Amino acid sequence: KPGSMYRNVRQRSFTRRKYMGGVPGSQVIHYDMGDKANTSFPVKISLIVEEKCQIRHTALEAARITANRHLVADTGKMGFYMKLRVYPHEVIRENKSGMRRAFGKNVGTAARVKPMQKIFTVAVEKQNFKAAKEALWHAGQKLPTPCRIVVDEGAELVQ
Amino acid sequence: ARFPEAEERLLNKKICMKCNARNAIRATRCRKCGYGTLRVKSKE
Amino acid sequence: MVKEIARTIEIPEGVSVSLAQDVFTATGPKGTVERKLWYPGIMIDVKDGEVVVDAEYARKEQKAMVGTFASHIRNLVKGVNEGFECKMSIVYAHFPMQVKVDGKTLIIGNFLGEKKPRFAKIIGETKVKVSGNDVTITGINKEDVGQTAANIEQKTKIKRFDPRIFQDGIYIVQKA
Amino acid sequence: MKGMRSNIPRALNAGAQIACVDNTGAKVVEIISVKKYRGVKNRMPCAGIGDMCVVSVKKGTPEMRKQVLLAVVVRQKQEFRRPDGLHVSFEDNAMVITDEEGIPKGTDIKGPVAREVAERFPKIGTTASIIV
Amino acid sequence: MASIHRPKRGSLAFSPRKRAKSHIPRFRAWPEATGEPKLQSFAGYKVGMTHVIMVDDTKNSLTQGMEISVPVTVIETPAIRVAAIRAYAEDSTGEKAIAEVWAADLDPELKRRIPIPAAGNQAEALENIGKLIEEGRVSDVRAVIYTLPKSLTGVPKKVPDIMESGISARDLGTKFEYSKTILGTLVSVTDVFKNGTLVDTAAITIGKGTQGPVKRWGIQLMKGKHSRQGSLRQVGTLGAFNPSRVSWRVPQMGQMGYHQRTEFNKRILKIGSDGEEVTPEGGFINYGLVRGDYILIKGSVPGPSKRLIRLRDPIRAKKADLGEPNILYISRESKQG
Amino acid sequence: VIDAKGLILGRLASSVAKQLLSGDEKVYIINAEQAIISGSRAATLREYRETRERGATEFGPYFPKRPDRILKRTIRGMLPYKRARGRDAMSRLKVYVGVPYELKGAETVTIPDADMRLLSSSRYVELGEVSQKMGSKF
RNA sequence: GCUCAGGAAUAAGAGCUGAAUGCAUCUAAGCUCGAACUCUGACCUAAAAAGAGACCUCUUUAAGGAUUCCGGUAAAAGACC
RNA sequence: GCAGCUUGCUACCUCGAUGUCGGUUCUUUCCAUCCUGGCCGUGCAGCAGCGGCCAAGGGUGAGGUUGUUCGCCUAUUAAA
RNA sequence: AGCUUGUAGUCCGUAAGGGAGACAACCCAGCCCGUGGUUAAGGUCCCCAAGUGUCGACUAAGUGUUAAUACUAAAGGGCGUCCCAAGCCCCAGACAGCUGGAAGGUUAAGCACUUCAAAGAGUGCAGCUCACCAGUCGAGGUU
Ligand SMILES: [Mg+2]
Ligand SMILES: [Mg+2]
Ligand SMILES: [Mg+2]
Ligand SMILES: [Zn+2]
């Protein structure tokens, strides 16, 4: 089931899980990566999406896996702090016959994100800025939206 | 046998990773496909 | 600082060059060469042993065109003043090629045992001498000498074998 | 293979049963296919004199029977012409059992054999006594 | 559908297969000259077929040297008269007839074809064509020839067949001067073709009437149970649902035969002068006996007996000089037995 | 009499079409093979080889090969030639390759706005080369 | 029985000259090769090509055509020879 | 993402009928090319492969079961 | 989904004429008849009435020459080309090319230092090669 199916945002938010049945939970494991204690990272960059899209939990997990592996192989295991801001709260339901009784079963969750809303926030040192930026570039290739990187902290620290 | 100028004009070029097109040894981008990564032609 | 897109070619002594119509001709001791060099918006002027090529607009295509035209003009003046000489090597593994010049085409006999000789054209008023193990090419036109060397090296291209084992042919050791 | 000197019609086609006339033990062999014959649509694979054929033994010894072998047809009732203009024909068809290259399995061939197959497969010519 | 593939029935190279617009074949192209001046074409009449036992001389053949029996085709080829000399002016549009000069003396039998041109502008027409060649308007010179079938007893006609035969020379002045030499004369076939050389034979083939698609294109007869359901010699389908039209490439009935056809590399085997050398006992069937000078062509030729055959030197001859043949036996036994 | 040496094909065709639709003059267009067509040579030859081998043999567009007939076809496109006005306009138009014999010594007029030097690139091919690469003899 | 090519322009590609980018670079202009494809070349048809053609001959109550007649190299009727 | 060549979904056309599968016959078309032609890479020594690019001019067959399409099997074949 | 089912307005149904190539419902327009004039939408190179219109740039791909739309291909990439802005080196001489060296070291078997402007536990087919200081044309280079 490709991500083009559950991508466009034309339906309201289906998140109240006490009035639905049996949501298969997200495959996304963690939401904080790297040094979860050092708040003294001067250069901080964030990956933002520039469309209104619904990111599946599997897409978020794949993007997090590629970004975290690239950052661990670039800046060491404790030379970065990467934050996946958005939780997949929407429940995605598929009509698994014909169109009679078409309200489908829940087949997974997803996160509805607005334009310019940050997905990943990465805090790195001065020298590891390029590796973090390039890993965030690899992260957005696994997402269903055009993504552009924006610098949070230390804009003067880079150029 | 293997000759110096023969390997200069035969095995001293780069190859595109995608399209496998011959490109110059000093070129960092394929002329045909525009791919960014080129490898030297194998000689062993 | 301030760019100058215009370029200047000093015409050396003994070489008389004109720009009658859009064709550029350089006449000198080594020979004479006529060439067509017309691009829109690029003005070429010959005067007093020096030619300047300049473009009205300064966009990147105009800069590339003025550079290419200046290089062509200087190659023409060097060919008609001193000329060009190119070098190639004749190296074989097992079958000794018989290389000879029988007109305006070169002869490559017994190339890897082939009973039909390969024929390589000679471009322009180009002199090709097969002096034993190596070939020497001379001419007043750099494009003609380069294309003659290219024709000789291209017609010796083995077309199915590994080049890491089969390396026979004629190869350039020095360009124009 | 090597061109013969005489035009030979492709009389026999696939499914024909031909009296195998060598001492290989196979008596009747049915023509399954013909080597070096690409067909056309609906055309049965035809085999004239001097053609190697894939055959299955129909009658013969218990060990030769039901095998798929290579055979060369050496006689045919369908008349062919020699280069001098004369047409040559035989009283019956016949094939010998051979290999891929033309060497017969048997040691003597009873009856005549056309001289074209003798000139093409010289072992078939030498093995057979009377040549026509 | 797992498509079974068959080549197309018949050739579309010869369409539209209509009745040819003349009993005389016409040559659309002529070979370039490679030697001394000479007519590039001759015309004869096909008598029939026989066979010779000639020693094989074809190089690299399997049966070289040994005896062979080659089916030949005797052709009755008397002398022809080069009637007119016609020059052509070439331009952007194409070749155009710029001037002609007819011979002063001509055969009386020509009136059955065309009214006899007077013996008028012979020197002045020639000088006009010379001036046209000099100034540069003239590009090629061709000769008009006709057969003289009044002698032949196997061909019922006595009217000449007029046709153009290009001259084979190097320079247009050379072509003009050779045409001046041969204008209005009788040139035998030995002055055009040599013994053993290939030629091209063109002639309107045997008319077979309005023939069906099975014979005209060799389409398949209906097979098995379909052989006796009502359509046996008919094409199975004329088209698909779309496009909603019958294509021109579908096999269909129409005029079969009597088309113009060109045969390449028809060798010449003998240049004879007496018809009793080849005429069999009882003569030829439906022709008679040969009474003029003939040429023996190897193999078949388009057209039946008595048909006009146009002979030109080859336009795509692959092979080199072939030499004189060595005929051991021209089979003049009866064709009726 | 229009000398079509060094003129754009479409601009010359539009000018001649409007002149013939004015409705009085017989227009001869000599040197039709020397007309200019802008664009790269590869694209021009691709479009003209696609248009050449287009139609069916019984119905389809028998697009010409000669340069004069191609120029006549292009002027035919910009006319209401299926009407009597268009038929009269196409009868009053003659296109020649080179100079025919009856137009030697005649007076010519060339369109200023249809000139080829108004273009600002080297990307052009002549109509004669396109006709020649379509297999034409002229 | 016969049933070939050759040549031109080309696709992928391989190069030469050459700048943008002082060098290097098959490309941005330019040039040379490069296929069973395309074009020419062969072959069949083709003045009903509306730009409806060129040339020569014969002759104006003729030139010549058709029919009657004897036919077949052609032929469903016409046509054709 | 493309195709619309499998199955779906839908109900817009046709119920005063658009004769419904498969085969056969014949013609044509697309290229996303199986073979034939030209190239590039190789962990290409040659032979023979493997992968890719250009290319639709030609070829792409005969048989056993099964109504079959599909698929299997047989022996040929440049490929079937 | 040119799917199905609602809601607000306006349409077709029941809507001409003018224009989008044709277009039930898209734009102008709601329309008794005839004449004259000027405009709406949209267009003005020809087909076709009116611009081979003006100014300033862009595009080199026949891309495009397609308001709305059931009639119009994406993600990704481009040292293709045209711009804006900001770091860095920069006529106390950079960038890219051309000349002397990568010499003390170490074989910690490099490719499984006191101190000198100029030499590593090392970029490359033990000499064969870059990073790097000196000179050089003499001006922009790179991110
Ligand atoms: Mg509305
Ligand atoms: Mg209403
Ligand atoms: Mg309306
Ligand atoms: Zn590449």
mmCIF file of N, CA and C and ligand atoms in Angstrom, chain B residues 15-21 23 30-35 38, ligand 4:
data_model
loop_
_atom_site.group_PDB
_atom_site.id
_atom_site.type_symbol
_atom_site.label_atom_id
_atom_site.label_comp_id
_atom_site.label_asym_id
_atom_site.label_seq_id
_atom_site.Cartn_x
_atom_site.Cartn_y
_atom_site.Cartn_z
ATOM 1 N N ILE B 15 34.071 6.390 -15.707
ATOM 2 C CA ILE B 15 32.818 5.822 -16.184
ATOM 3 C C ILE B 15 31.691 6.293 -15.278
ATOM 4 N N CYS B 16 30.571 6.681 -15.881
ATOM 5 C CA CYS B 16 29.404 7.080 -15.105
ATOM 6 C C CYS B 16 28.845 5.898 -14.325
ATOM 7 N N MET B 17 28.377 6.172 -13.109
ATOM 8 C CA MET B 17 27.799 5.115 -12.289
ATOM 9 C C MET B 17 26.448 4.669 -12.828
ATOM 10 N N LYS B 18 25.656 5.600 -13.359
ATOM 11 C CA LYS B 18 24.344 5.236 -13.880
ATOM 12 C C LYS B 18 24.434 4.684 -15.297
ATOM 13 N N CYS B 19 24.852 5.518 -16.247
ATOM 14 C CA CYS B 19 24.751 5.190 -17.662
ATOM 15 C C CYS B 19 25.979 4.489 -18.222
ATOM 16 N N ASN B 20 27.058 4.376 -17.446
ATOM 17 C CA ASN B 20 28.286 3.700 -17.873
ATOM 18 C C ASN B 20 28.924 4.365 -19.090
ATOM 19 N N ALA B 21 28.757 5.671 -19.236
ATOM 20 C CA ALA B 21 29.325 6.382 -20.368
ATOM 21 C C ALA B 21 30.746 6.815 -20.052
ATOM 22 N N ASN B 23 33.685 9.217 -19.645
ATOM 23 C CA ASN B 23 33.916 10.624 -19.376
ATOM 24 C C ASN B 23 35.402 10.824 -19.134
ATOM 25 N N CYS B 30 29.209 13.407 -15.253
ATOM 26 C CA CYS B 30 29.041 12.746 -16.538
ATOM 27 C C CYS B 30 28.477 13.714 -17.569
ATOM 28 N N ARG B 31 29.038 13.670 -18.780
ATOM 29 C CA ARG B 31 28.598 14.583 -19.830
ATOM 30 C C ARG B 31 27.254 14.160 -20.404
ATOM 31 N N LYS B 32 27.006 12.854 -20.493
ATOM 32 C CA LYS B 32 25.748 12.375 -21.055
ATOM 33 C C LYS B 32 24.609 12.533 -20.057
ATOM 34 N N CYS B 33 24.704 11.850 -18.917
ATOM 35 C CA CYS B 33 23.588 11.765 -17.987
ATOM 36 C C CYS B 33 23.613 12.828 -16.899
ATOM 37 N N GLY B 34 24.756 13.459 -16.651
ATOM 38 C CA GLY B 34 24.838 14.456 -15.606
ATOM 39 C C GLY B 34 24.951 13.908 -14.203
ATOM 40 N N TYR B 35 25.190 12.609 -14.051
ATOM 41 C CA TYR B 35 25.343 12.010 -12.734
ATOM 42 C C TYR B 35 26.598 12.535 -12.052
ATOM 43 N N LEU B 38 31.425 9.406 -10.596
ATOM 44 C CA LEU B 38 32.099 8.659 -11.643
ATOM 45 C C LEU B 38 33.183 7.790 -11.027
HETATM 46 ZN ZN ZN J 4 26.738 9.058 -16.937
#
